[PDB]
Amino acid sequence: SAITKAILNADAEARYLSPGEIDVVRGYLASGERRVRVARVLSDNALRIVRGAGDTMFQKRPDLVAPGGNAYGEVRTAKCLRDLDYFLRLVTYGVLAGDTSPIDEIGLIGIKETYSLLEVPVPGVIDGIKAAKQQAAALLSSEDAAEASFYFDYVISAMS
Amino acid sequence: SAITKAILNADAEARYLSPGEIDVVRGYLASGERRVRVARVLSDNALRIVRGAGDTMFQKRPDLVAPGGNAYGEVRTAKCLRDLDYFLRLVTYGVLAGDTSPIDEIGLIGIKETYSLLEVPVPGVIDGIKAAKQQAAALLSSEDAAEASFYFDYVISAMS
Amino acid sequence: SAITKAILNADAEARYLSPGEIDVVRGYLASGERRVRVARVLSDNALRIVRGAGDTMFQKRPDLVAPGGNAYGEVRTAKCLRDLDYFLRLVTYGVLAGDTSPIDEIGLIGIKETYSLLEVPVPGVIDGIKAAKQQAAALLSSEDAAEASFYFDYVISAMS
Amino acid sequence: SVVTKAIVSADAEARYLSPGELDRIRGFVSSGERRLRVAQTLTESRERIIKQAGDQLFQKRPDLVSPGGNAYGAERTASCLRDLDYYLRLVTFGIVAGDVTPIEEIGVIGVKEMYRNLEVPLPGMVEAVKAMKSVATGLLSGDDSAEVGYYFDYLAGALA
Amino acid sequence: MQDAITSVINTYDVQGKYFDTSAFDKLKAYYATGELRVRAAGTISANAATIIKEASAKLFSNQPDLVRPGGNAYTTRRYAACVRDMDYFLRYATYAMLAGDTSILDERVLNGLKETYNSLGVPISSTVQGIQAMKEVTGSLVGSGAAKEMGVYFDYLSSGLS
Amino acid sequence: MQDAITSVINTYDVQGKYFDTSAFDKLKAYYATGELRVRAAGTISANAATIIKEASAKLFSNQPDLVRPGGNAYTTRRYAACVRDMDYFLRYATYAMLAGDTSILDERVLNGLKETYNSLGVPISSTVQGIQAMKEVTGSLVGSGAAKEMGVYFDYLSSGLS
Amino acid sequence: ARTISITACVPRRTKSVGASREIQNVYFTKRISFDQFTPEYQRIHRQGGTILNVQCMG
Amino acid sequence: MLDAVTKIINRTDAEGRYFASKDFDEVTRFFATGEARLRAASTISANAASILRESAAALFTEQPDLLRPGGNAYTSRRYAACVRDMEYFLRYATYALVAGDTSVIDERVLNGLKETYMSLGVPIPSTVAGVTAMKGVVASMIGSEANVYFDHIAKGLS
Amino acid sequence: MLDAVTKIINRTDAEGRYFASKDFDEVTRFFATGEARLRAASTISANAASILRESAAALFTEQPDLLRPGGNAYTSRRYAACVRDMEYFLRYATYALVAGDTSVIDERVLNGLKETYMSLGVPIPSTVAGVTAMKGVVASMIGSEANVYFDHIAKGLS
Amino acid sequence: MLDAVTKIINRTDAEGRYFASKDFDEVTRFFATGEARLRAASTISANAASILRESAAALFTEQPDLLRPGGNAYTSRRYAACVRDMEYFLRYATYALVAGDTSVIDERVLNGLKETYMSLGVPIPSTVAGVTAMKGVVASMIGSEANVYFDHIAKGLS
Amino acid sequence: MLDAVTKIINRTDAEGRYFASKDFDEVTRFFATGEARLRAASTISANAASILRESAAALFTEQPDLLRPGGNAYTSRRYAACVRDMEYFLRYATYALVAGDTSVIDERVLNGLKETYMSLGVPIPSTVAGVTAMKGVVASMIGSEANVYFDHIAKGLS
Ligand SMILES: CCC1=C(C)/C(=C/C2=NC(=C\c3[nH]c(/C=C4\NC(=O)[C@H](C)[C@H]4CC)c(C)c3CCC(=O)O)/C(CCC(=O)O)=C2C)NC1=O
Ligand SMILES: CCC1=C(C)/C(=C/C2=NC(=C\c3[nH]c(/C=C4\NC(=O)[C@H](C)[C@H]4CC)c(C)c3CCC(=O)O)/C(CCC(=O)O)=C2C)NC1=O
Ligand SMILES: CCC1=C(C)/C(=C/C2=NC(=C\c3[nH]c(/C=C4\NC(=O)[C@H](C)[C@H]4CC)c(C)c3CCC(=O)O)/C(CCC(=O)O)=C2C)NC1=O
Ligand SMILES: CCC1=C(C)/C(=C/C2=NC(=C\c3[nH]c(/C=C4\NC(=O)[C@H](C)[C@H]4CC)c(C)c3CCC(=O)O)/C(CCC(=O)O)=C2C)NC1=O
Ligand SMILES: CCC1=C(C)/C(=C/C2=NC(=C\c3[nH]c(/C=C4\NC(=O)[C@H](C)[C@H]4CC)c(C)c3CCC(=O)O)/C(CCC(=O)O)=C2C)NC1=O
Ligand SMILES: CCC1=C(C)/C(=C/C2=NC(=C\c3[nH]c(/C=C4\NC(=O)[C@H](C)[C@H]4CC)c(C)c3CCC(=O)O)/C(CCC(=O)O)=C2C)NC1=O
Ligand SMILES: CCC1=C(C)/C(=C/C2=NC(=C\c3[nH]c(/C=C4\NC(=O)[C@H](C)[C@H]4CC)c(C)c3CCC(=O)O)/C(CCC(=O)O)=C2C)NC1=O
Ligand SMILES: CCC1=C(C)/C(=C/C2=NC(=C\c3[nH]c(/C=C4\NC(=O)[C@H](C)[C@H]4CC)c(C)c3CCC(=O)O)/C(CCC(=O)O)=C2C)NC1=O
Ligand SMILES: CCC1=C(C)/C(=C/C2=NC(=C\c3[nH]c(/C=C4\NC(=O)[C@H](C)[C@H]4CC)c(C)c3CCC(=O)O)/C(CCC(=O)O)=C2C)NC1=O
């Protein structure tokens, strides 16, 4: 979390929170209402976002669901949609936390070698997450959409 | 002691005591009677040495025992005299051991942090220890006083 | 052995056996029959090799068994010939293993300290081992003699 | 020397010399005249020391000067005796220095490698150094004999 | 490092000779001055902080621009480093005086010091002035013979820098 | 380090070419000499201490002032350092002979060695004489064809030091 | 002085996995001097590790 | 370590579910109390040396035998180590006040502390009394807001 | 570590005798089996990625609750580590298959593994299930030539 | 480590009092015995290699099984480690003899030594026999001046 | 430029003092070394071509890549400039040896040399290696009398 990062910075120097760290924590606490609003909108609309992103991704990359595709079959396609749901939930976690530590800890550390070992196409995942970003931005206001897009883009850059 | 320091040295190079270290141990055992005499004089005269050193220190620095001073009050003045007594007994230990190791172990390591956090003026402690050094030299011959002054100035230099 | 060295080299790099390592293992396996033949000839004739080596060494250096010699007496001469026997056995071990690792682990590591503490003349040992190598070369064919001489010269070089 | 050792020990700790180190140096410099007298005594009798030492060594190790020996012949025996001269001069250096440092750098570090490269047997060296001890401590009074015996014991241990 | 005794030892070892009358005179001369050196070293060690306070105060009084802004000794860090370097010079002069030989000043101090100071921008003339200030302050504590001895090593440092 | 094989691979890779008949001739020549090289390496490793003993004996016989006081090999420490230098020279010469290539001598031995010897005071001409002694003894041990092969790397070291 | 034996478990949860052997530095028992104890205590805590056992030899 | 938001996040990640109404409620309560906790922490930090001095004085007034020869706090070194442990407690309870979670106390403070003290001979009840004294001194300045973290430390030792 | 020849050497060295006819026979038998073991090891190496992939799939089809939120294999990092452990097991079983003796498994793999999994929380029976699935895949691809080493890993775990 | 003088100083510091008459008497007793202790230590040091050689010979004549194949002293490596350990015991007993106190033997030798020997499989009764043989040799050379330190080693190993 | 006498004169003038005894002694010491320095300078001047030849040979034996295509010494012009630079170093080090002061090197050689080399891509560590090789050759001929001056040039490039 933002608070956790400030406290770890203080702890590494065996000191108290510096004025910069206090100002950071105050700004993070001030941003709480808009963070909660964005996360609640994304959480209430998770099924819509994931279904729409999956639809767009399979419409742009039909090979994945076709026979011989990585997501071919009902079970494997369900796992693909579940991964999109995982990444949307991680985006909401990062939005609430004010940093990307939950996203890294839960979902990104090791994801790249995981997908490479499972033959999962990372361009496909990136397309799905971009579709999820668009679906989320459709449900959010432009200012809130930018805040969510920060974390959607963080996930995309982690994969790319 | 001197013996312990020579043994530690020989042990670091994993060898028996060398001619120089035998000379150190022999010259220390030779000085035993003189060290015992000096320690006896300093020990039996601890009360008057501490009374005189405290009187001199307080005359030199009245603000310590003035209101708002670190030593103001019966309890704080008593602890001040007790610290002077502690340092005198440590000096006796250093004379007996033929090295400063007991003084470091019991009194010096951490005394700077202790006195900084308790707001104890280190120059005042130095003044009291100098007063104790002259009061001891009054009680000893020139050679015995020179022997004790080594450890007194060692304490003072560790302070400063 | 050769196999153990190949495996350890592969394990240090956290990888499977490389084609060069696989060639090493395959070549050692192919040589196994010749290695067994040499080791069997050496083992079946240990008494005569050690006896001839001891006689040659003691003839070259009668002082080792003269009064005041390191191997003087029946007990110490028996220990001497036992040492030569140990080195012959370790040579068979190294011929079989395809490397010098048994020779190092069982008899080479620490031998310099042991003999120096016991005042065993290392040149005497080297003369005895060279005599044993000549005895072995007598019983073996030229290629077999070269193969055994590799590990004999390894022992000699390790002592000197 | 004692002074150089104390200074280097203090310097690796970025401190001024302690009362113990200064006491060591005082004991060293007050012993300087006696040390110089003992060094003069051993220098005066250098040729006699070397001659009876070589006599005893070759009497108790006749193989050295017998055919095949390391010191066999006239020039090799001369080199043998020149080594004892080197080591006696090192002992005098170490006596004036107050420790075995000059001995250690000039004559102890690397000696095993050098007598291996020269085929000089080290038990012979130890016997020769012990013979020099006996001859040289025969020439001094009670305290000086033990003091010089310590340096000779240092050599004997370092050669063994 | 090399002290006076090991200096004699090295000369005689290199030329391969036992000590003669001349070596014994040099060694007697060193031993005779030993008590004065030990006394001076104990006095300097007991007073080192006071010596540094006085010398730094005299230096910064004579050159106030060092500790004002734009000076090389202007910050708490650079002031602390300045008096730290003065602690070096006092401590290594005390070592060289106790050893009776300047070899430690070559090995442990002067080697590369001009290059360090010229790379840092540290003014070397002001450093020599500070060394001189320590020389007078130390001489004020140790007395005639010890002052004359310590001044040799202070001047060696000054010459090595300047 | 590069061997003969890797030297050929380096040329053809920087030229981006497949092996042609000339490359196969060169690689074939290395494979042909491989058995001789292996036998010479085994002989040298078996006799390494004897080689160092005989060669240092020759070097200190021709230049006896090296081991007397004032020589650069007078002390046990400096004598040991000298024979250790000779041992390393012999082992790297054997490496280069096995590889059929002097690259390991450039990469591990020669670079900065002359400047180090100059800074320490090691007499470089005497070092070259010791290397020549090791060459003569080694060539006596390993036979004529191996002598020609091994002397090339011995001379490479001698020229690098001269 | 005195030596203290610390048995600790220090996971790798802050970074990605690797093929190299890693088990020995993750779970370990070492004793260190008293003056090194605080730095090692804090280093174990900082890497998310757990201190399992503390003993004073003697 | 965890703060309150990451603790709620780790819980929801344990069920693998999005934030529901109660989770957002906990988060918004934490955001509401953040400013008060920040002011309490700044107050503690501003008076750190004073709080530590008073708390050490209280500890050693109630248990004078800790300082007497033979007591665990009798030397300059052992007294300094005692006061340094109390400084740790103050700093990390302040960290936990800012975070809103006693995690940092568990990972960075109480983890192995009890075994360390027992292996060293440090008396646990005297350290608990010191934590209680420090708690009282802090609550005399910032109110009852840091009480839970000092209680957590004391029970972790207890 | 030991191989079969070195193990026979140690057995001859403990009792301090030269190799006898039985010892030479055992060594000769090990040399006779070398080509098949080498080809098996090469077959495992050339298909290591596949073997790992379907062995992980077999484990997680057998026990899907490992992957579920709250399971020990639920995160990208923990799944990575699970598959990495299975890679450890495959590579070291192949080492033991080339060596012909299981000492490398005992020193590099099984040494302290159970304690480390208890401390970490990795379920031993599920890890053993993964080891058995990997054994099944390896035996399907090369035959029964590697079963002893996988059984050794499993027994050392359970 | 502690010598006798530092042991006395530690007692007086634990009691918090200056040196009294009996303490100075104990210190004077140590200073009185110091010269004889130095002579004995110098005698041991001068003949350390010889002492070690007959002590090893006495132990291995007493227990020839250790040198036989399958014994703990059977290899050049394990023989070297055994004589190395005996040299440790001799040198540290000499240290304790000079220091007048057995502490250095405790924190430098006996601390964790039994656990080390069980982990290695070293026969402790045989090590105690080696210490006893060393005791006999040293007593034959210098007298009974070092007996208590060798007894301390033997009892701390038992 | 300055020499030793002018350096001492400027030092005495910065203090506004006359020459003291120590200053006269320093000037006398400089005058005493004049004959050896002049013979050394003449020896260098007589063998300048050989010194440069062996220095360049040593440089390019150490680093043959410099002469290969794409090296900074690869062309007739670039090799010419390299040997001309070393010739400048030799002549100006001889000047500084005669003067006894390194000011001529600072005035005529290091006046923008490092900036010039960094701008042109002249490899400075290789240039320093060449300067040090020339130092070695000059020392082999005349001894250490010139070493410091060569070191100055190296320090001017680093
Ligand atoms: C909460 C943290 C977390 C993440 C992120 C995660 C991803 C993840 N997806 C997996 C499989 C999979 N992942 C996908 C998804 C891919 N298929 C399509 O091509 C798309 C491009 C793409 C998704 C957008 C598919 C189809 C599989 C099944 C592949 C197989 O089992 O062979 C696996 C291997 C184990 C399993 O089958 O569940 C992981 C670990 N798991 C986690 O515990
Ligand atoms: C045996 C080794 C040892 C030492 C060295 C030692 C010093 C020491 N002095 C202390 C307090 C004190 N020390 C002093 C002494 C000062 N008063 C004046 O200012 C003078 C400048 C100066 C003495 C000359 C005073 C007044 C206190 C009480 C301060 C307070 O209560 O906050 C304390 C804090 C705990 C206590 O109250 O006792 C320590 C640890 N304690 C030890 O166990
Ligand atoms: C299997 C590994 C192994 C090796 C290699 C080994 C060598 C060995 N030989 C020893 C003694 C000995 N070794 C020798 C033999 C030497 N002296 C003669 O002069 C010859 C030059 C030379 C033999 C060719 C002798 C005479 C002794 C007895 C020395 C003594 O105890 O005083 C000892 C000391 C223990 C003892 O036997 O009393 C060892 C460790 N021991 C091992 O367990
Ligand atoms: C930009 C960072 C910086 C600082 C802060 C700094 C402080 C500083 N204060 C100095 C003197 C001084 N500073 C003080 C200040 C003290 N008087 C009372 O005690 C107060 C507690 C306290 C001030 C509130 C005094 C009295 C002196 C004169 C001390 C003396 O000469 O003995 C000096 C010595 C030279 C001079 O007088 O200019 C420095 C360098 N230097 C720096 O480079
Ligand atoms: C100052 C430190 C120092 C020492 C000590 C030293 C010893 C030394 N002794 C040598 C020769 C020798 N040294 C000896 C001595 C041995 N002969 C018997 O075995 C005895 C056990 C023993 C002497 C008591 C002999 C016989 C030689 C001649 C070797 C030969 O001819 O090859 C040599 C070879 C060079 C020469 O002969 O001049 C050295 C370097 N060198 C040093 O720089
Ligand atoms: C070569 C010898 C070797 C072994 C054997 C070894 C095992 C091992 N596995 C680890 C992590 C792990 N290991 C697993 C294994 C999985 N957990 C369950 O889901 C599965 C049933 C099971 C595998 C089939 C997991 C999930 C972790 C991560 C645990 C965590 O970080 O919380 C760790 C902790 C360090 C790290 O995270 O990399 C070790 C030491 N390490 C070694 O160096
Ligand atoms: C940031 C997390 C952290 C903690 C919690 C921590 C506690 C801690 N306290 C220690 C010692 C100590 N702790 C104390 C304090 C106790 N003794 C007094 O009597 C009091 C009752 C009481 C304190 C209120 C003392 C006296 C020692 C010294 C032990 C000794 O040397 O005998 C040590 C041993 C290391 C050392 O002293 O250098 C640790 C690790 N260290 C850490 O890095
Ligand atoms: C100075 C402090 C210190 C001590 C005390 C110490 C003891 C010690 N002895 C060891 C091994 C050993 N110790 C022995 C000695 C035994 N063999 C038996 O036959 C004898 C009866 C008996 C001795 C009299 C042996 C044989 C080993 C080798 C064990 C092995 O490698 O299998 C080891 C294992 C590490 C190594 O091999 O170097 C230690 C730590 N080490 C230290 O640093
Ligand atoms: C009298 C005072 C004086 C000095 C000191 C001097 C040095 C000097 N060397 C130069 C170029 C150069 N210097 C070098 C030398 C380098 N080549 C590398 O391989 C070597 C490591 C190294 C020499 C040891 C080279 C190759 C150039 C030409 C660079 C270019 O033109 O690209 C230049 C740039 C202009 C020119 O090319 O002439 C100067 C000014 N010139 C002067 O008038």
Residue numbers in the entry:
A (entry chain A), B (entry chain C), C (entry chain E), D (entry chain D): 2 to 161
E (entry chain K), F (entry chain L): 1 to 162
G (entry chain M): 2 to 59
H (entry chain H), I (entry chain G), J (entry chain I), K (entry chain Y): 1 to 158
Copy text from the publication.
Phycobilisomes (PBS) are antenna megacomplexes that transfer energy to photosystems II and I in thylakoids. Here we show the cryo-EM structure at a global resolution of 2.9 Å of the 5.9-MDa PBS from Anthocerotibacter panamensis (hereafter A. panamensis), a recently discovered Gloeobacterial species that diverged from Gloeobacter spp. around 1.4 billion years ago. The two-fold symmetric PBS contains twelve APC hexamers assembled as a heptacylindrical core surrounded by twelve PC hexamers, with approximate dimensions of 273 Å (width), 500 Å (height), and 129 Å (thickness).
The two top core cylinders are assembled with ApcA1, ApcA2, ApcB1, ApcB2, and ApcC1, in which (ApcA1/ApcB1)3 form all trimers except that D3 and D'3 are formed by (ApcA2/ApcB2)3. Interestingly, ApcA1 is not in the same clade with other ApcA and ApcD subunits, and ApcB1 is not in the same clade with other ApcB and ApcF subunits. The lack of orthologs of ApcA1 and ApcB1 in crown Cyanobacteria suggests that the top two core cylinders were lost during the evolution to crown Cyanobacteria. Instead, the N-termini of the two ApcH copies attach to the C and C’ of the pentacylindrical core, leading to the giant heptacylindrical core and expanding the overall light-harvesting cross section. The top core cylinders (D/D’) are essential to connect the energy transfer from the chains and the top side PC hexamers to the pentacylindrical core. The assembly of ApcA2 and ApcB2 in the D'3 position is essential for the function of the PBS because the D'3 trimer mediates energy transfer from the chain to the core.
